[PDB]
Amino acid sequence: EVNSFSGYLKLTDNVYIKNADIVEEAKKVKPTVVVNAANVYLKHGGGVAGALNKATNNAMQVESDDYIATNGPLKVGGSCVLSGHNLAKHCLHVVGPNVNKGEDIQLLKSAYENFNQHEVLLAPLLSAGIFGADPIHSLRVCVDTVRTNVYLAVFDKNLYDKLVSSFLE
Ligand SMILES: CC(C)[C@H](Nc1ncnc2[nH]c(-c3ccnc(OCCN(C)C)c3)cc12)c1ccc2c(c1)S(=O)(=O)CCC2
């Protein structure tokens, strides 16, 4: 079956959320698009990007280095479409701002706007974790910006509960 997402909670007509590891979701669902929480040089050294790359047995990193050689780095707020490998048909590498490294939080709207070029996506919560954005703010920007169908996988039950409670206020 195609895009067989299971156990998500529907927040709006186009945003769904689950307490799950995005890697495990991608292996099970094999969505049309999986979003990577990338950096501008597509160096998948840890966190979500390192976990997605390891699940491809480093094929994503080799492909990413070849893309950077020919095209140069992305911009913060920008994206590129590369292979999904064994995880999806495509991987949309999206650069959210890293607030802990001084980048502008307003670029989070530009980052989520990349999602609107794809009908259905499996994605992480952009700029959360060690990128330093307030995760409740990142969910509000996602809900206000994305118009296509997005399935958010958040791998932390404590944060999942805080995000759902924050949305349902
Ligand atoms: C907020 C947090 C809960 C969330 N984390 C995650 N959200 C969704 N899916 C996730 N998988 C993993 C993961 C990390 C290590 N190893 C893994 O797999 C190893 C076991 N397998 C072999 C069974 C999976 C983490 C993760 C998240 C959201 C956005 C960002 C980050 C973190 S960040 O990486 O800190 C910076 C970039 C933006």
What does this structure look like?
It is built from 6 helices and 7 strands, in the order ββαβααββαβαβα. The protein has 169 residues and is an alpha/beta fold. It has one domain (3-167): Leucine Aminopeptidase, subunit E, domain 1 (3-Layer(aba) Sandwich), CATH 3.40.220. The strands form 2 sheets. A 4-stranded mixed sheet has the order 1-2-7-6, with helices on both faces. The protein starts with 8 loop residues before the first strand and ends with a helix. Ligand A1ANZ binds at residues 21-23, 37, 47-48, 51, 124-125, 128-131, 135, 153-156, 159.
User: How many structural domains does the protein architecture include?
Assistant: 1
Predict the CATH topology. Leucine Aminopeptidase, subunit E, domain 1
User: Structural class, please?
Assistant: alpha/beta
Bound molecules: the ligand CC(C)[C@H](Nc1ncnc2[nH]c(-c3ccnc(OCCN(C)C)c3)cc12)c1ccc2c(c1)S(=O)(=O)CCC2
Estimated share of beta-strand residues: 15-25%
Q: Please state how the strands of the largest beta sheet are arranged side by side.
A: 1-2-7-6
The coarse overall form would be globular
The biggest beta sheet reads:
4 strands, mixed
Using the coordinates above, name the CATH class: Alpha Beta
So, CATH architecture?
3-Layer(aba) Sandwich
Number of helical segments with 4 or more residues: 6
